[PDB]
Amino acid sequence: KDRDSQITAIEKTFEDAQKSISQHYSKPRVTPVEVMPVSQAMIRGMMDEEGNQFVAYFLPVEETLKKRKRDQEEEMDYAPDDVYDYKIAREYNWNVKNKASKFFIFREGDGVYYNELETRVRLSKRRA
């Protein structure tokens, strides 16, 4: 149709989301409490095997066997199909070879700022 209206309509949401809100859409009876403002790569896990890519699932604050998840590629023919594992050492830990399991968009409280970081390709790993 036209761009001089699209520029202002896209900025219009960027401006209206920051106004004062005190009412619902269907029945304006519910008062708001707070607001949650908004590449990526997520390793899916199988619910039976129950996969521990992080130390959270292991119920751990930090890595008791590492200090940096150096997510490095499995090979040269697999950029999206890397090999994520929590091993700072060349130790034969759980080698979770994140196969290519090729919208699931992710965001965060980035200091109450307007951005996005939608995911690129749902990979899923197993115990190799």
Partner 1 sequence: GNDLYFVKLPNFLSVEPRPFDPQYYEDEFEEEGRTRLKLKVENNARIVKWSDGSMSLHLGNEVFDVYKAPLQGDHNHLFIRQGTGLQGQAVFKTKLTFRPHSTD
Binder of partner 1 out of 58, 95, 102, 107 (CB under 8 A)? 107
Sign of CA dihedral 84, 90, 95, 100: positive
Nearer of residues 120 and 127 to partner 1, judged by Cβ: 120
Is 122 near partner 1 (CB under 8 A)?
A: yes
Restricted to residues 58-97, the positions that interact with partner 1 (CB under 8 A) are: 69-73, 79, 82, 84
**For the purposes of burial, counting CB atoms within 10 Å of the CB of 53, is it exposed (0-12), middle (13-18) or buried (19 or more)?**
buried
Binder of partner 1 out of 85, 88, 102, 116 (CB under 8 A)? 116
Restricted to residues 15-44, the positions that interact with partner 1 (CB under 8 A) are: 16-18, 21, 24-26, 30-44
Distances from the Cα of 22 to the Cαs of 18, 19, 33, in angstroms? 12, 10, 9
Count the neighbouring beta carbons within 10 Å of the beta carbon of residue 125.
24
Strands 117-118 and 82-83: unpaired
Query: Which residues of the chain form contacts with partner 1 (CB under 8 A)?
Result: 1-3, 6-7, 9-14, 16-18, 21, 24-26, 30-45, 47, 53-54, 56, 69-73, 79, 82, 84, 103-109, 114-120, 122, 124
